[PDB]
Amino acid sequence: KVFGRCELAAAMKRHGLDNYRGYSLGNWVCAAKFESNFNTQATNRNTDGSTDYGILQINSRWWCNDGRTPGSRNLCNIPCSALLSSDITASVNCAKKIVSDGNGMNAWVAWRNRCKGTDVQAWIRGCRL
Secondary structure, three states, X not given: OEOOHHHHHHHHHHOOOOOEOOEOHHHHHHHHHHXXXXXXXXXXXXXXXXXXXXXXXXXXOOOOEOOOOOOOOOOOXXXXXXXXOOOOHHXXXXXXXXXXXXXXXXXXXXXXXXXXXXXXXXXXXXXXX
């Protein structure tokens, strides 16, 4: 599924991400934009043998089981395939754990490079939330 911008913002707000750990909704929409371009099916294989899955590009070394990543630890207790769903619930629930893991949103490389320190409120422009 490819979400519209405001569509995703409303879904993220429904799932409690607005101001979660002090990160405004715009931060989360910006992260998704540059991690996956709002595509739930996005996947990216890393050189280290892990893969990043779904709308928030969650990594298979630590967070989900894809059964092909050496030394993996499945800390969200889900198959990585669950992160490729149309429903963002599993991704959001796992993202709440990640953002609490001692690095804030710096866990998402694209957020750090393209969102951090910017006017992220622009990402919810036009949205009726």
